[PDB]
């Protein structure tokens, strides 16, 4: 029955798939009822690459500021080798990264 205290660490470029996954997350895990926290929500990094517009000195001095704003996002979750694996497999998706930095 070996217990493990996992920690769930997410990141994307859309606030709309992403929020989706700690609604699914923390209600595809309170179905499971797990001992967990609520979607912690980490300082928004947010890169601004100044660049001039022109192809050639010429031409006024005419500049840009395009950037990726991630929303970093993490979680928690206990549960054995069986019911963290059935959870990590499920949320499954476009835009997004899931780590399972495990705490054995």
């Amino acid at each position: 029955q070996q217990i493990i205290k996992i920690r769930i660490t997410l990141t994307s470029t859309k606030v709309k798939q992403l929020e989706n996954v700690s609604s699914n997350i923390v209600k595809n895990a309170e179905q499971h009822n797990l001992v967990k926290k609520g979607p912690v929500r980490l300082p928004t990094k947010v890169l601004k690459i100044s660049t001039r517009k022109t192809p050639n000195g010429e031409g006024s001095k005419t500049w840009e500021t395009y950037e990726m704003r991630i929303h970093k996002r993490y979680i928690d979750l206990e549960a054995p080798v069986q019911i963290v694996k059935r959870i990590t497999q499920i949320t499954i998706e476009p835009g997004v990264d899931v780590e399972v930095v495990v705490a054995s």
């Binding site: 470029t13 690459i49 660049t51 517009k53 840009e64 500021t65 990726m68 704003r69």
Partner: protein, 52 residues
């Protein structure tokens, strides 16, 4: 063979563009190592919409 290639590690000539292959203008800023006219170009795609 000293007698066809020189001591090109550090400077400008060493590294060159990804897309065109030029030395002129460089975007080092974030494993990017393109040129600094092209970039923009695609880019809007690549990630770098805008927000201004």
């Amino acid at each position: 063979n000293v007698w066809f290639s020189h001591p090109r590690r550090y400077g400008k000539g060493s590294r060159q563009c990804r897309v065109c292959s030029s030395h002129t203008g460089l975007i080092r800023k974030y494993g990017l190592n393109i040129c600094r006219q092209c970039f923009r170009e695609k880019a809007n795609d690549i990630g770098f919409n805008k927000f201004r």
